[PDB]
Amino acid sequence: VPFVEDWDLVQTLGEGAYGEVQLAVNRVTEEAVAVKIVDMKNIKKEICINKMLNHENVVKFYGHRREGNIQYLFLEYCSGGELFDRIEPDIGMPEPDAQRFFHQLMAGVVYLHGIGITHRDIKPENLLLDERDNLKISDFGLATVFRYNNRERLLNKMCGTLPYVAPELLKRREFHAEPVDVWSCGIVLTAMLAGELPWDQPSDSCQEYSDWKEKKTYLNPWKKIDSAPLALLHKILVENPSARITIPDIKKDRWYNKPLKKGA
Ligand SMILES: CC(=O)Nc1cccc(-c2cnc3[nH]c4cnc(C#N)cc4c3c2)c1
């Protein structure tokens, strides 16, 4: 069928460092995809990782075409946009909605970690929603292999987003990858349930961070969060990444398993 590889770029979905992500609609089928435009004048690795990914809570990769200097990455389109725009400032969102998004977040992260991949920059800006509000992890531009041939590699590159970074990345030369993603997922949860981020960064100089370690949960964001999800956050946002809760244990947490939401 003629024309079936022609795509009209119809709308900018986002504009980072690389360039842009455009909504693309097929000339013939009208299938909608997201196309990432990355002017190579680092993405080879983003593509490399994207080729490994196949899961319902991970933005699917379809393929890429290079034309001269620009690379075109063809990616699953998520019509619900970014989790960020479901978080009402200072309020957050209804707890059953946060729990469902957190469930889906975990399934995605479990998957990635299973294939030896760390995202390194989980935040509501990078967590996308499809037409049925299913969450999908996006943007693998900072992602990296932390396990290959069943051997773990400790990380050392400082990367991610300060309010979402785990404290070890600021304090230690090297660190395990998985606890960093678990930590960012907890800050995402906090934001979902409080509509505010708890600190500019998790350093002992950061007053809001010291207060959290001092267990001042009569202060915001923590006062807004119910005891049950707050109890989970006390297990996730633990300074020592060796003592921090693992994802298999997050799946056993009382809040995680609390019935709250009716089906679609
Ligand atoms: C109406 C509408 O579609 N709004 C809206 C808003 C924000 C992000 C998006 C968005 C929708 N679908 C996507 N699919 C992607 C795959 N990879 C990247 C990267 N890196 C970003 C997106 C993306 C972004 C869509």
Side-chain angles (χ1 to χ4, degrees), residues 98-113:
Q99 198 207 46
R100 182 179 171 274
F101 293 141
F102 195 74
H103 291 162
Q104 300 178 349
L105 186 53
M106 283 311 89
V109 182
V110 162
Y111 173 75
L112 293 172
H113 289 183

Side-chain angles (χ1 to χ4, degrees), residues 11 13-14 18 21 23 34 36 46 59 75-82 128 138-140:
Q11 174 178 330
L13 301 179
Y18 53 89
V21 180
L23 174 57
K36 197 167 164 171
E46 183 171 346
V59 169
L75 302 148
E76 179 178 0
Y77 172 64
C78 309
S79 68
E82 307 179 357
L128 304 183
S138 85
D139 197 344
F140 283 87

Side-chain angles (χ1 to χ4, degrees), residues 89 140 145 240:
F140 283 87
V145 164
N240 175 1

Side-chain angles (χ1 to χ4, degrees), residues 66-84:
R66 100 175 224 170
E67 275 161 22
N69 303 127
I70 312 203
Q71 270 279 349
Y72 296 98
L73 310 221
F74 290 75
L75 302 148
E76 179 178 0
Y77 172 64
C78 309
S79 68
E82 307 179 357
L83 189 58
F84 185 79

Side-chain angles (χ1 to χ4, degrees), residues 36-208:
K36 197 167 164 171
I37 330 298
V38 292
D39 195 0
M40 304 178 307
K41 283 182 152 187
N42 256 186
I43 323 302
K44 188 173 164 293
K45 174 166 160 176
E46 183 171 346
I47 297 168
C48 172
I49 293 177
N50 265 284
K51 283 173 180 176
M52 300 166 65
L53 320 181
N54 185 216
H55 184 273
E56 53 269 36
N57 299 126
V58 172
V59 169
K60 184 70 204 184
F61 184 61
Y62 302 126
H64 72 114
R65 188 163 199 179
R66 100 175 224 170
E67 275 161 22
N69 303 127
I70 312 203
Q71 270 279 349
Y72 296 98
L73 310 221
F74 290 75
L75 302 148
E76 179 178 0
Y77 172 64
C78 309
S79 68
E82 307 179 357
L83 189 58
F84 185 79
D85 289 279
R86 314 302 186 80
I87 296 161
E88 190 185 332
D90 199 44
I91 290 291
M93 79 177 59
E95 191 180 305
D97 293 2
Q99 198 207 46
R100 182 179 171 274
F101 293 141
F102 195 74
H103 291 162
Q104 300 178 349
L105 186 53
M106 283 311 89
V109 182
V110 162
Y111 173 75
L112 293 172
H113 289 183
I115 58 164
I117 300 292
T118 179
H119 183 278
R120 305 203 285 184
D121 197 31
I122 298 167
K123 43 176 186 193
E125 292 91 326
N126 282 336
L127 303 170
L128 304 183
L129 291 190
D130 75 3
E131 65 286 337
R132 291 177 160 171
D133 275 346
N134 292 311
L135 174 154
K136 323 275 192 151
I137 296 168
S138 85
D139 197 344
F140 283 87
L142 297 183
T144 198
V145 164
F146 74 95
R147 206 206 297 105
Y148 196 79
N149 295 330
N150 210 211
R151 279 316 263 73
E152 188 185 351
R153 296 157 186 232
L154 303 178
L155 304 178
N156 57 73
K157 180 194 190 185
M158 275 177 83
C159 61
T161 306
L162 273 170
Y164 300 95
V165 297
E168 63 273 23
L169 173 152
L170 313 176
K171 296 154 200 64
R172 303 309 177 176
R173 192 181 59 266
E174 297 182 293
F175 42 93
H176 291 276
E178 287 168 288
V180 187
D181 290 333
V182 168
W183 179 281
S184 59
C185 288
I187 307 299
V188 164
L189 188 51
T190 306
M192 288 198 301
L193 294 171
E196 63 172 318
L197 293 172
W199 43 71
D200 293 323
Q201 56 179 101
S203 50
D204 278 59
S205 62
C206 188
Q207 185 55 51
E208 285 61 36

